[PDB]
Amino acid sequence: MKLSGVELRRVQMPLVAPFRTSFGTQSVRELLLLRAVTPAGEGWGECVTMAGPLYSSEYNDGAEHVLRHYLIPALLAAEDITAAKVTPLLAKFKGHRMAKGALEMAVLDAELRAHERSFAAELGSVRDSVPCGVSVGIMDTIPQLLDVVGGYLDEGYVRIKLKIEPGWDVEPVRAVRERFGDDVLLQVDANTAYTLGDAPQLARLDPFGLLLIEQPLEEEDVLGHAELARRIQTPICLDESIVSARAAADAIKLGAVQIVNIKPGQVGGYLEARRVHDVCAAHGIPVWCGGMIETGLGRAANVALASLPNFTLPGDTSASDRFYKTDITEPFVLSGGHLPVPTGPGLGVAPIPELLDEVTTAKVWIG
Amino acid sequence: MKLSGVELRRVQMPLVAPFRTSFGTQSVRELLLLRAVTPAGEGWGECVTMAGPLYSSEYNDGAEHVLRHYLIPALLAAEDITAAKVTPLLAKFKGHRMAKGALEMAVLDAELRAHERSFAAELGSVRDSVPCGVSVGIMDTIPQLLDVVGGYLDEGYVRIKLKIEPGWDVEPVRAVRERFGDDVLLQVDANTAYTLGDAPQLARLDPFGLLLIEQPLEEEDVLGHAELARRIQTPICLDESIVSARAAADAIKLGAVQIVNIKPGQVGGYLEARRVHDVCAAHGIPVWCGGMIETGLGRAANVALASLPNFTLPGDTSASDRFYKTDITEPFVLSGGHLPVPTGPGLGVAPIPELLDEVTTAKVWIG
Amino acid sequence: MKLSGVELRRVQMPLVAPFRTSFGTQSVRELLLLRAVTPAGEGWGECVTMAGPLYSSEYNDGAEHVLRHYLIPALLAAEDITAAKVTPLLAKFKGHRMAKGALEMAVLDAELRAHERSFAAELGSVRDSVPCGVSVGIMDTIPQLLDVVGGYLDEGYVRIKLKIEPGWDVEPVRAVRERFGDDVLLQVDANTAYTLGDAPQLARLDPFGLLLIEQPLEEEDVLGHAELARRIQTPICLDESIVSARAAADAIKLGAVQIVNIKPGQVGGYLEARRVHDVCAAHGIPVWCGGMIETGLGRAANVALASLPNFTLPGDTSASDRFYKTDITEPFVLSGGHLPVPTGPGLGVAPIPELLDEVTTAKVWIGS
Amino acid sequence: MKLSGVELRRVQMPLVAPFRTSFGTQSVRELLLLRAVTPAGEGWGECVTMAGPLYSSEYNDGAEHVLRHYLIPALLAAEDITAAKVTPLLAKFKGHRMAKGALEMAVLDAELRAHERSFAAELGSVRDSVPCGVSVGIMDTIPQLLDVVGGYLDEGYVRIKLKIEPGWDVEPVRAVRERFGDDVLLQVDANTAYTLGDAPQLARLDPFGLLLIEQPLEEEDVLGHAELARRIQTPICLDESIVSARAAADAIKLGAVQIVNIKPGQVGGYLEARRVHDVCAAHGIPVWCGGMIETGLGRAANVALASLPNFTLPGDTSASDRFYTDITEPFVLSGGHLPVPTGPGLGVAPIPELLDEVTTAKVWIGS
Ligand SMILES: O=C(O)CCC(=O)N[C@H](C(=O)O)c1ccccc1
Ligand SMILES: O=C(O)CCC(=O)N[C@H](C(=O)O)c1ccccc1
Ligand SMILES: O=C(O)CCC(=O)N[C@H](C(=O)O)c1ccccc1
């Protein structure tokens, strides 16, 4: 396979409801989409960067620049290209895992469509549907949270994940546990908002039987997470820190993590994502799939990934209408708390051209 | 697809020269071959068991029985099969990794042929050819050994591996180093033939700068290998002990292994073999591909596997003519110390019926 | 003080000689300069990013973008500004340590000039001049390397650092040792080019008595460096991995490093650089100052930093004419293998406008 | 800058009420004050030594002697001095951290005023006010204590700290918890009064939700503190043991401490105090600022220091009217907080009428 070129497309899609996290409230999602063109056909990738560098150092403009001037040219200059060979060819470029992963996603989509093989087949799926949780952001009031959580439970989601913050942590959890019982799968995500010194306060969440606390401390404080694991009873889940299979290996060796959140864009592609799943499986560490408010493209790839054997916890693979009234692909519709693994070649979904054009704010061809 | 059936075939192929290890001399390789047939097409698998349970608990007759009465029936009874689902379907059957791996190899060959995809593509190859070492057995004299080793170096092999045993260790290595110099990649394999108490004698191998010592102690004495690593300087390579990705993870955690020999049949298939490669890579542990005097079928899958990124030491992926004057497939011919990674769909090679029938001693159809 | 604005100036400076490292041969150094303007006066900062993201994830264009659209706007919106408050104000922007460090450098220059205090005073200098080593890149032949090393020793540099790479390691070190003796302070830098599996080959460096092997493995493989340290004899020095005081603390706790290279831009500024120095001092770990082929501006701040008490090994603070025939500032001239710590307010140095304009390829004003 | 001289002053100041700790009952605080004179201006330093060697080996008379005959001469003999060079210049004198820290304090005030820069600026303050706790000494009865702490809570203090001793520990804590509730920030300090053999009693303090136990065992028993920390559940805080940044580093490496009390005079000055803050911060260890019943001079420097980012627990930086009247502008509590001074240097200076009023001795060491 020789890479003919890549179309970078900048897309803006409005959310049905604002989503508030430890670093801001967002009403519209700005995305970066890649259409890789090979003699065999087209392939699509999605970048999980956002407008600004508030979640990680990568953001849309920087991803677009590094892709346009380094990564895509490097692949275009290669004598032969395959999805597996993408990593060695872009290795001399330090960092930029989300851009690399988006590019690899597009390459792998094209490659697999050429072989009439799905992402689920290539990654090694063993399930035909995946159980799906939902991630509920920070709310302004407690009743407002209880209402949103009850609505999502009525829709059939099998797990609730609450974004927590200093000043908004023990109370919601208590409110949700009191109104909805102890049998609901409940977990929290802190987005690096705490410090090892906040260990007593986080221990106040022990009686509520959460499945996990996701990334309480800073991205690079792996040892601090191992220390925190000794002081609380809720299992520690790492997200922002898990950027590679080697990173998961090291965090496990150090006792810093008991459950791993695999974000394919964050680890540099779905291939590395499978590798993270595999090392965690070898060490007895459960994994689940993380979300980034993706379109149907990334959502489809994520459902494929989430059907692998060591995904023993429901992922952040919600339905399309949880974020978008109109997805740019075939919509993902919740059925009994589950999503069906796509079966078509490649991603099993593709942009609907009229819908994609209505949300396209920019496009450029690199060739 | 749905598995339509499996042709189980017993093959007897004579070796160019006897091959002697700490547990016996092999002169005729008795093998078990599998032909899986689906509506999509054919696939070939090879079992690496031997006639008797001298290397492991698995042997040809026992493999045939467990395949015929448990594994193949279980796969035939599934509504849908994929190479990835072979492991969950055969999970209720404890053990029998080599038979399972052969069955998976045949299913995967058929699956990949249906998609016109090579083993190298599915496993994640990054090289078009692999560098090849050779494994030299125990000899009667030192001059014999020196002549055989020089003959293999003149053929262009890039690494020499010496089978060692009590009474045949320090002297052959000294002889090889004195006759051929310090630049030859040299390593030894003992096949569990030593004991922790023999640690001083193995330390007598320190001055010669071997790459590794392969399986000094027994299959289950992993802790003993960690102790041996504290007592000797030559890096320790585990073979018979590496039966799964979890086994490798555990041995790495215990400081029992610094280089891993991946034998796909021994770990239960090529998919598990890739998982072992990935687990080792996350821990900084180099891997290389192991041999079992396979035919061109297993040899082709081995070359594919050995082209993955963390196979950073030359494997036991020798040419066909080091073992067989003919071989049942298109031969693997050494060119500049390298073997070319097959590019055809599936294994990229298939049996030549004329030759295969000449060496078949039994065949049965299970469907 | 409120920041009135920042001038971003892009500069292109030709090198006296090519400089080759594990990721390329460089003939011209492309730089970012920041001119912070406050009611009290001016301050200068320098970014240590390079043209492309070959050394780290940050590169010139990306640094300029994040500065222009996030960091400088964030500071302009601050009611009160001090160099110390730069870190909390930019905390919500993850990463971009080199851009942040350049901005903090400019703010700190302005603040210290407003208070008539030098960088050396603010950082805690204890000596008036610093000893200087030199970093020599990969060469084409061994004789070329021997000639360059002898020439640099004749200039009076007190330490030699050789860029090493797979295939160009044991031989250059053996050659330098044989010709120039056992008393030359010698050390090597690999720029992440090796792997734990390459441990035997790096052990072949054990007899030549190097001070350190700098960053043999990847940035994020800290455990791998501790394990290499168990298998070899030369002390392990971390460079690319030391991005913060917390990073240094963790590497020391894990046994991954015995000597730390402090690159102020790499850790996000000179205040964090001091913090790294203090952490390493508290654990008995020597530090030395790292270079990024900076102008006289970054060089002045670097010698100031390198005059702190725990910088007990010569840093990559070479003289100006080692890289540039004409520095944009007053030059730094080697005197007996030392450079003098500036004494003026702030950096103790400022760009000479005729010289700076000759090498300026772009400039933009971001302001209120 | 060339030190012109230092005026040594003995100050005797009445406390609002006696203050009792496990090492004695206090009725008047005798202190030692320093007036450094440089050509650029004046600076004031305070020594935290007390009348006798009851808290540490340093006491007022001995501090004055080592200053008058060794430390001040050494600084006077120097061509150029800066606050930073004070430590290297007095380094050949083993020990005497409190005297050196006071001398450094005065030199730094003079230096900072000469550059019209505050202490908070040099140290790197990021907050304009700091939250203040109060330290309550041993009382004669349980109700007597409750009146004192309730009065301190009515004044607006945000944390209550109780001095403990053999015979005064579980009971005062139970009383405060039941009378004043579970939301009061409460901690205890033993001043080395217990042993590892007393570990059982200190385990009885676990149910009441204290923030920490300050210095249970002797200053030099760091290992015993790590042994204790395994055995009890309330966090361990070290005070007397933290005498340098290297000492905090060593205690953290040994697991002997999770919260550090930074006493600038005890660690040898405010510069070292900042270094201790930075070391703990790099290790994820919260710090808080400690008091030594200082005047407004030490109180101003302590408030500045306590406004650095890792002071995440309210320090012993109580209001001036908790002990005194003060020889500077009093520090008046506002909503449980004190304001960080903004003037040059300390931002405060003695009011001559009040300073002379309490001065018992004066001597000039100079040129
Ligand atoms: O369902 C979805 O798509 C979202 C789930 C989600 O919260 N993703 C991550 C996280 O776990 O931090 C995230 C990342 C950035 C902002 C907000 C959230
Ligand atoms: O090139 C080849 O196929 C041979 C390499 C080799 O020695 N394989 C293994 C081993 O490591 O014990 C083996 C195991 C059992 C019998 C014979 C060999
Ligand atoms: O003398 C100087 O300024 C340079 C010294 C030096 O080598 N700096 C670093 C390094 O350590 O790799 C570096 C980083 C990137 C390119 C080239 C060098």
Ligand SMILES: O=C(O)CCC(=O)N[C@H](C(=O)O)c1ccccc1
């Ligand atoms: O509020 C204040 O200034 C005092 C707080 C305090 O108790 N300081 C220390 C200590 O922690 O042991 C101390 C030292 C000497 C005597 C009495 C107390």
Ligand SMILES: [Mg+2]
């Ligand atoms: Mg998360």
Ligand SMILES: [Mg+2]
């Ligand atoms: Mg073997």
Ligand SMILES: [Mg+2]
């Ligand atoms: Mg370096």
Ligand SMILES: [Mg+2]
């Ligand atoms: Mg105390």
